[PDB]
From a paper:
Cathepsin K (CatK) is one of the most investigated cysteine cathepsins, both by academia and pharmaceutical companies. It is expressed in high levels in osteoclasts, where it serves as the principal protease involved in bone remodelling. Cathepsin K (CatK) is a target for the treatment of osteoporosis, arthritis, and bone metastasis. Peptidomimetics with a cyanohydrazide warhead represent a new class of highly potent CatK inhibitors; however, their binding mechanism is unknown.
The obtained iCatK comprised two non-covalently bound domains (chains), namely the residual propeptide domain (Glu5p to Ser83p) and the main domain (Ser87p to Met215), including the C-terminal part of the propeptide and mCatK. In general, Gü2602 binds to the S1 and S2 subsites of iCatK in a manner that is similar to what has been shown for the Gü2602-mCatK complex, with a r.m.s.d. of 1.23 Å; this value is substantially increased compared to Gü1303 in its complexes, with a r.m.s.d. of 0.19 Å. The major conformational change, however, is in the benzyl group of the P1 N-benzyl-N-methylacetamide substructure. It is rotated towards the residual propeptide domain of iCatK and forms new contacts with its Val72p and Gln73p residues (Figure 5(A,B), Table S2). The network of hydrogen bonds is identical, and the pattern of nonpolar interactions (Tyr67, Asn161, and Ala163 in iCatK) is similar for both Gü2602 complexes. iCatK was demonstrated to bind Gü2602 and Gü1303 in an analogous manner to that observed in the mCatK complexes. This indicated that the iCatK active site is competent to bind inhibitory ligands in the available subsites and can be regulated by them.
Residue numbers in the entry:
A (entry chain P): 8 to 74
B (entry chain A): 0 to 215
The structure:
Amino acid sequence: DTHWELWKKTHRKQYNNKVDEISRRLIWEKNLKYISIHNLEASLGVHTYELAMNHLGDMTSEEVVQK
Amino acid sequence: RAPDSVDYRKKGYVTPVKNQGQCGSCWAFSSVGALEGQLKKKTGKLLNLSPQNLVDCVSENDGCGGGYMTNAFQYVQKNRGIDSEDAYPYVGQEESCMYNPTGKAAKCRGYREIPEGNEKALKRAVARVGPVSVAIDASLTSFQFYSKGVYYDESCNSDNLNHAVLAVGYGIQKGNKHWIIKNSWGENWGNKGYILMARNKNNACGIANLASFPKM
Ligand SMILES: *C(=N)N(CC(=O)N(C)Cc1ccccc1)NC(=O)OC(C)(C)C
Ligand SMILES: [Mg+2]
């Protein structure tokens, strides 16, 4: 997909094989969906803050601060 | 009257946002940021101190495997100095302690700990001393993708400290009190590498649970 390719190129992402890349693409798709919902909720006064996709889009929140 | 607000970025106490990368050196970035603030306050000069010096040389910490800001300050003291970024650059992986006294940019005569969970004491420290090293729960997706506004997530665990950052001030936005927090995940995270974290919301993310600063 054009967006996934541009994301990987921009953040210089590399994967070890097709399974690893698809598994990381799946986490990224789930994070995009999370961001969209939270921001909708923020537009309705549910949150005092908003979110955006960044270089950590293909990781779990736990992975970011663990291993 | 004027609001009770502080932002040390406006006084040139704060260096630009760094990127720790794929290394668990958040504590080293937090430590140098606190040291940078005090060096500016003492000598009037603002320069990048070496996180890599702390990663490669603080034996009581684990370089890319985590550590404490207090242990970093104690090393700088016992070592009678820390080098600049220029004399000891960041490579984002631990190596052997190539500390060089010729590149010394700062010293430390001890450190201070804010009383556990006391946000008012943290506030007074930031107001009177300058940037203060703090630890938080950074483990939520809400933090991972933070972009703008005042970060307040009730799921955030103050008994689960896993990340070190720098409190460079405090204020209020849209009636929400905040801490001005400098992160070490580069300028592509947050608001150009910064996050506003909720202030006086029952010690949200443990912001005042493990807060410390160097004496210079
Ligand atoms: C920050 N870079 N950092 C290290 C890290 O993320 N590790 C090693 C994972 C981890 C940290 C804390 C608890 C469990 C796992 N964080 C860090 O050093 O955190 C403190 C709380 C300052 C030790
Ligand atoms: Mg999560």
